[PDB]
Each structure stands twice: as structure tokens, then as C-alpha cells.
Symmetry: D2
Subunit: 295 residues, 4 copies
């Protein structure tokens, strides 16, 4: 029940020898816990989930749970390529305390990931999941959009409670909110760049990589939008566009981690094959933040 | 000066023998004149401008002028592939009474249409145009987005007064409004599907193919947005999404003309190579309107 | 009848004041006439046809005719966006001496350029053309591939004698040769980069921008391929790949004109909005030629 | 050393309860062993590797080894998203008898999979692999092409012996063969559809899903190409284009498995989320084979 609100999709910190740094993870989460988030999204794209072993994925979810108040929502990335693997991942993450499973669309075989394929995959996971399911569409990583007709069909399932859409197409989001209006189905935006427009069209939250460093600003944007302060919402939204692009489509996770370092959080390195930013990328990353008055 | 408001991009009617039907054009414009539009956009993509001879393009603009109150704005599509041709088209359209020139990005050589190329093309047209210039970005027809840095540079020109963006990317629109905030530069949305989100991010109007048949609804959406009625704006916006897609990306101009017939306007045929809708397309077109309560 | 062989798609030279330089055009054509080409392709993409007035397009075709032996084939680019305009352009170009009309696919309304639309457009032009018609598919400029099923249907027309394919997909070319094997229908490659593979799959020629400067090399590649010298064909083909990309997808017509200058032909400027190469582009253009031993 | 020749990328058979059917796998491999292949490619895209557990991936490679003559080459798909995971997978597959590791490009974070990222990933795997490494580029699944400059750099590594390219762009393949001519680096085509053109440009083999059912035909195409029988090679190549597309881009693995059933091999079901073909897809699959005289 109820997923409305702002979540940072949390990173996975690593040591100099590429192990998971649970100390730093815990430290970062205590800092982020100060912000009026609804909870944490663990092992979204931003958590480098493809780079973790099965049991790292489990242990990460468990530690996040232990570093959170119990009244905060833990949305766990349990998607795998295969339907059966996904079910098992979802069950095990429920067991270490996830409140909901966020399930990315299988996409290695886009060619054959039709509506019917995606509908079946999600229906089976929802049928067998002990926790509610959130659809997760993120085309910049997957090359695929969960189609609208599939979303509408899936919204009817009692154990499918909403979706996070990362495509940034507000017409699509609007259409989804409209077409699922008769269902218990809540739409979360997938980044801080199009949060305002999303609320305008009926989304009731956002999972934003940018809230790892500008949590208060992102939460302020939520408050302005829910409160009808659209004029101030606009000024704030505008100033978040470039920093948001900076840590998402422009420089990705290495950009996010670098910005985290600069803001006093533990950003640290990514796992190979992800690389450090070149000096020119660092420079450009700094510009997107400083020229919008954030650094 | 001042381009804010709603415009229908008007179609060009043709006779059974594919001539321009100026009688029907005039009849349609008298009907559309009843709606509180800011004016008419003539020879946008929706006017089938690529299919008209030089002098048809001129005569169409002239007739529209004669069928309009003088206090209504006539934005004329004067873009051609070559910079020099564009200048000449812009001058001649000024002479038959256009208030502003809407100039589509040259796109046959996308490969070489860099920022500098587009900046030069527009600077020359703006330098030599007797009327103000509106940038026109429509990737679904062109395969190219006028890049943001080019838009920002061009917004500084005294004779470039805004742009119509048809891409539907509200983050991009937001960014443009933000980055040009210090200039006289007004942003118009390029369709009724993302009108609300556009106003939210700072656009001050829309050129909407859908206003050829639901003019009052589109104008109502404008009123709700300017008036802070965001909740009602939403309900209305949602109901316009599918009919809007129906006459734009789904069925294009033949879809628009068919819907016009059904609403009692003169829609008529397009010029070859455009074709009639198949019966199944007609059926689907009807569904998008009837299931949203418009027909 | 019979379009097999190599053609350079000829450029249109311009003066310092952007007029058509017919003197330079004639001079270039006398030089290119030395090579064993089948003829000239006039007003392909490489002739900047979108940038010319109606009557420039006509006069260019007429002058090329006058500078050619009558036993050489003049393929004239007569495509326009509208079916009727295309017919008229085709008729008038026949009158100034074109041997065949090369008709680019209308593409401003890709969305509605279905197979049936393209089939009708071409059937009408072929029905009314006094000269044979060659289908012209060039997606890098158009954003569309003439679909295979349309090509097969059109190959059955008595006045449609082949196609130039510029996409570079040899599986598609192979399929087309196979599926039209029962018809009089000859396939020309659209660039020197994939000429060898094209001959291997059944194409019987090429229209190559690169033959404006390496005519003898391109003709040599033809000779090696027709003669079964596949091993030497390979060595030669390899050395043509980068210079070919240099004057096509990398630097386009400005790249071609620059290379023409350097080889002693008249390259000259393009019409705005096309721009000169930056010094770094010039440098890279030089590298693609020098490191493959051509300059 | 030496990877030239034809390989079928073998499927993974499953039981009615979605277990790996090692009996059927072994039976299929004994049948395919009759054809003059160079060996087997195990856990390419066609083996549904993303759908298998770690130890299934290992056990599959081990069983294939046991069902093969030792003089036949086993190329094992050991790629994972993370560089470290890939190293471990490569080591363990070497241990169960793989002759070479075929390593797909990590692609979940395309945005950050630059040349340098891909160069580092492959250099580390090649540095630590006990067996030679084959680069694997398959954009239809990944959304990314291993860039040419990266391929050229990697070809210099002593433990990187070639690549399988699945993109079908023969200009790119030609360029790669040319640019790596000074290295020990062999290029394999990624499908039977562009095998002939590949040999023409310098590839020395193919990994072809189609050889699971038309092994003798694919091997015949190899023989005709190596033997200079280009005219017969062409006739044969043409007839393989549609059946090849049928079991790859059109209907994928379910299409391949269905065709396998019809040819008397064990095709069987895929793992969810992959679905059965609809009756209309089955029909179309049958057409692509029957109309080319194969069924
Ligand atoms: K539900
Ligand atoms: K201005
Ligand atoms: K024919
Ligand atoms: K090597
Ligand atoms: Na709902
Ligand atoms: Na402004
Ligand atoms: Na033929
Ligand atoms: Na080599």
C-alpha cells in the first residue's frame, strides 16, 4: 500500500579493492535519512546491481533495511533477465526486509519482449511475490519502453501497485495515469529533471538519482508541487535540470559518485567496467552544478 | 512582439482534382475564427507546404490574411532548405501580410546541420526578414532537434522572438525557458498532447493540430493553466492525449482531415503521395475520439 | 534499357556569390569524362538539388547533357515531395536530355510514407514518365528505407528499370536482387565503400561520390569484380573505405568539394546552410586520404 | 590459435518443467557433429545464457565438451556485465574445457561504455584468461557496437585472437580486417545472412544460428567462397537470407527452436520470459523456409 513520495536510488559504495563498503553505505544512509524521503530505492540502475553477485544483492538490501527506520519504505531492485530468477530474487529480498519489489523489464532479447511476454513475466512475479510489485521502465539502460497497453493490463493485478518510469515522456506518463485511473496504481517519475511535469500529469512521486546530493531541494520541489506553488516549483525545477542530466544521461554513476564526494558523502569508485571521469568531464560536471548555484 | 496563445496550424484544402480549394479554406477559417485563438499558423507541417508550388504558398498566406481579423496573428511557414530561398520566401510572405515567419530547420543534410550551420542560417534570415522570426523544431518530420545551445544563441537576436518545439520533451523545453529567461523569447508547445506540462515549465502557448477540431477544448486548457486550475487542467489534458496522437503521430494529416470531415469542417483529401486512411485506421481514429468522449 | 556501371553523382559548383558556376561544371565534367564511367548522375544528394530553383535544376541537367558524349547515360534526380511535382520535373528533365529519372523517396511525412504510398507515388511517375525510372533510397538524408516489398512490386513495372540503394545493407541488397530476379531490374550500390560486396550479391554498378576524385580507382574496383579478381578487389576495396566515409557520412558535400579542390578539380563552396569544414575537419579529411595512400 | 570456419551457436534445450535437458543437448550435438563445422559456440545469445544460473552455464559448457571430438573448437560465452565477474567466468569455463572465451560487450550502462571502458574491460579479461579471447559485438541485443578504434587497439593484444561481429555492416567488417591486417586477428561473421559478403571483405568464418538446421548448406556456402565459386555462392546466399532472418531478427530463439522441431532436432521451449510463436508467426516462419525451397 502507498508508494507516493521521493526516494533516492542509493549507490553501492566500493572499497579501493572493489569490495562492497558496507560502512560507507551505512554512513551515507544515516546522512540521507535526515531528508523527508518516503524511503530508499536499493539496486535500481544507480546501485550498479548488474555488477553484484547474488548474495551481495541480498546483503546490500539487508544492510539498508538495518540502517533505516521501519516506517520508511525500502523498494528493492529484484529484476533479473529470467522470470523464474526474478521470482526467487523477489522472495529472498522480501525475506531480508524489502517492502516492495521494483522489477526492471527483461531486455536482452528486446526483439521478443512483446507486450504478452512482459505481461506474463510481471503477472508471474506478482502472483508469487510476497511483497507488492512496482513496474520499472528505464529505456536508456534497456532500449525498451514497457508499452502502455501492458502497463494498463498489469495495473489491474492486485499485487502490482505502481511503476517507476524513467523515459521522461510526460505525454506517456499522463496517458498511463489516465488509463489506470480506476486502479490502485501509483506512478513515480524516474528523475528530478521532469518531476514537476510528472506531478502535473498525475505522478505522485519520484525516484531521483539527484536526491543523493540535493535531497532537500528535491523534497522542496515535491512540497511546492503538492501545495499548488507552481510558480516557485518552476524556478526550482529549472535549476535542477542540468545538475540532474549531469548525474544521469551525461556522466552517469561515475558523475553521481564524483558529486557525492564533493558534497561530503562517500561517492568512491564504481566497479569495472565503469571508469573515472576524465578531467574535462569533471570540469563539465562542476559547471552544471556551479552555474545553477548549487556548488 | 507577443506570440503567446493558441494557434491551429491550418490545413490546405484540395479539390477532387487536387487544386487548392480557397473557398473551403475560407469557410474553415471563418468557423475557426470563433475560437479565442491568438491567430493562425499557415504552412506548418500540417498545411502540406512541401506539396505546394512557390506561388500557391504565397497565395495561401494571402487568402488566410484576407479571412482573418487584423488583430489576429498570422504565423507563416516560410522555411526552405536553402538559406537564400528562405530569405526570399520570408520577404514575400511578409508582403502578403504575415506577422511573423515560422522557419523550420533545414534537414535534408542532417549530417551537416550542426549548431553553427543552424545558427548562421537563422541569423541570416532574422537579419534580412522584415518580420520577426520564430524557430521551428519538428524532429518527427525532420529527424533533427534544433540544439539547445543554438536556441540560446539565437534567442539573443532582436528579430528572433521565440520558437515552436514539436519534440514533446518537457525537460528540453524547461531548459530552454530557463536558459533564455534574460531574452525576449517566447516558447510555444508543438502539440495539444503536452500543452499543460509546457505551460508548467514556462511555455506561453501552443500550435496544435488538434485545435482544428477541438478548438474550444484546447483554449479551455490554456485558460485552466493560466488561471492556476491545475486539477481541472489535468482531467482535460488526459482526455486530449489520444485524440491528439490520433491526428499527429498515429494518422497524421489524413487523420486530421478525416476528423475534420466528421466534425463538419471541410477536411477533404491530401495531395499525393499522402493517402486515405484504410477502414481499420478510420476505425481506430474514431475510437481515440469516442472513448475520450469527444464524438 | 541497361544502367550497369559506375557513375559519379556530380556536384553543382557555385561562384563566390553563390550562383551556379556552369563554366566550372563543364570543366569538371570534361575531366571526369576521361574515366570509363557509364555516365553521370545529376542532382543526387551530392548535387545539392534541394538548394536549387526549379529552373536551375533544369538548366544544370541541360548543361551536363551538352558536356557529355551522347553514348553516356545521364541519370537525372527529378524527385520532389509531391507526386504531381515529380511527374512534371521528370517530364521537363526528359526534355533537356535525361536518359533516366532517378526518383528519391518523398520523406517529409515519413510517418505516412507506407509501402502503398510509395508504390502509388512511383507507379504514377513511371506511368507518366517519358524516360525509364530508377528508385532512389537514401536513408541518411531521408530517414526512410524504401521497403523491400514495395521494391519487388515496383520492379514489375515496365518503366521502372532499377534502383540505387544508399543504405549499405548488403543483406537487403542481396534480398532485392533475389526477389526481383525474374524482372528487368538492375541494382546500383550507393557508395564506393560497399561496392565489392554489392557486386558479390548481384548489384551491377554504383553511383559513388568518391568517383568525383578517385574515378580510375572506382572503375578499377568494378573491373576486378566483374573479372573475378576478388583478392585484388579486396585490397582495393579496403583502401577506399575511409576516403569514402570521409566524403559521405563524415564530412558530406563540403568534404567532397574540399577533396576536389586538393585533386585539382573545382570543388568550391556549397550553398548556405552548408558550411566550410573547420581546420580540424580538414585535417581529418586529409588523414583519411593520405593514410590510405591516395594523397 | 586458428578460429576460421563455421560454428553453430548452440541452443540450450529445456524440459517441460524448464530444467536444462542435457539428454536432448547431447543428442542434438551428436547430430550436428556430422557437419564439417570448426566447432560449437556455446552460450552466445542463442544459448539463452542470460537465463541460466552460474553453475548451469558451467555445466552446459562441460557437457558440450564431453559430446565433442577434442579436435573441434569450443568457443564459450563467458561475458558478464562486470569485468571481475567475466574474468572468473572465463577461468571456470577454461577449466571445464573451453578452447576460447567469447566475451560479449557489457552494455547495461551503454552511456558509459566508451572505447576506453571497453578497451580496459577486454584487456583485463585477456590479461587474466588462460584461454584466448574473442571479442563479441551483437548490437541487436546490446544496443552497442564495439567501436573500430577499440577493436584495432585490442587486436594487438597477444591473447585476443579475433571477433564475432553480429551487426551485418560489411563496410565496418572490411575496415576492421584492413586495420588489423598486421595482427593475429580473425573476423567471424555473426550470421548466415551476410556470410558471403563477409568472406569477400576478409572474414574467415561465421557463427550462424541458421547452421543449427541448415548446417550442410552453410558449410557449402563456406566451401564455395573459399574456392572462388562466387556465382554459385551468390545463388546459395540469396536462398539463405530469409530463413536466416526468420530465426534471428524476425522470430529469434523461439523461431530457431520451432524450426529445429520441424527438422527433427530437439528445439523445445525457451525459458520465460521468452514465449511460443503465435500461429501467424509459425505460419510466416514456415513460409520463409518453404518459399526458399528448404522445407
Ligand atoms: K493494482
Ligand atoms: K530575441
Ligand atoms: K522493370
Ligand atoms: K592478437
Ligand atoms: Na490509479
Ligand atoms: Na524569455
Ligand atoms: Na533482375
Ligand atoms: Na589479421
Amino acid at each position: 500500500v502507498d508508494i507516493a513520495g521521493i526516494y533516492p536510488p542509493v549507490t553501492t559504495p566500493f572499497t579501493a579493492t572493489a569490495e562492497v563498503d558496507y560502512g560507507k553505505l551505512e554512513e551515507n544512509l544515516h546522512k540521507l535519512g535526515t531528508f523527508p524521503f518516503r524511503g530508499f530505492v536499493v539496486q535500481g540502475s544507480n546501485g550498479e546491481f548488474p555488477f553484484l553477485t547474488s548474495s551481495e544483492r541480498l546483503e546490500v538490501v539487508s544492510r539498508v533495511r538495518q540502517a533505516m527506520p521501519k516506517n520508511r519504505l525500502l523498494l528493492a531492485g529484484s529484476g533479473c533477465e529470467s522470470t523464474q530468477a526474478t521470482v526467487e530474487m523477489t522472495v529472498s529480498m522480501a525475506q531480508v526486509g524489502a517492502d516492495a519489489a521494483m522489477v526492471v523489464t527483461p531486455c536482452y532479447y528486446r526483439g521478443r519482449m512483446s507486450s504478452a511476454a512482459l505481461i506474463h513475466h510481471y503477472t508471474k512475479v506478482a502472483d508469487l511475490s510476497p511483497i507488492p510489485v512496482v513496474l520499472y521502465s528505464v529505456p536508456a539502460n534497456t532500449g525498451l519502453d514497457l508499452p502502455v497497453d501492458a502497463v494498463v493490463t498489469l495495473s489491474q493485478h492486485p499485487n502490482i501497485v505502481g511503476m517507476k518510469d524513467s523515459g521522461g515522456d510526460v505525454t506517456r506518463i499522463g496517458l498511463i495515469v489516465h488509463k489506470t485511473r480506476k486502479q490502485d496504481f501509483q506512478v513515480l517519475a524516474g528523475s528530478a529533471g521532469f518531476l514537476m511535469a510528472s506531478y502535473a500529469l498525475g505522478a505522485v512521486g519520484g525516484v531521483c538519482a539527484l536526491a543523493n546530493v540535493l535531497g532537500a531541494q528535491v523534497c522542496q520541489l515535491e512540497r511546492l508541487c503538492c501545495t499548488g506553488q507552481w510558480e516557485d516549483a518552476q524556478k526550482l525545477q529549472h535549476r535542477l535540470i542540468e545538475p540532474n542530466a549531469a548525474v544521469t544521461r551525461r556522466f552517469g554513476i561515475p558523475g553521481l559518485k564524483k558529486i557525492m564526494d564533493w558534497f561530503g558523502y562517500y561517492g568512491g569508485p564504481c566497479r569495472a567496467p565503469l571508469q573515472e571521469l576524465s578531467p574535462a568531464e569533471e570540469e563539465a560536471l562542476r559547471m552544471d552544478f556551479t552555474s545553477n548555484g548549487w556548488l
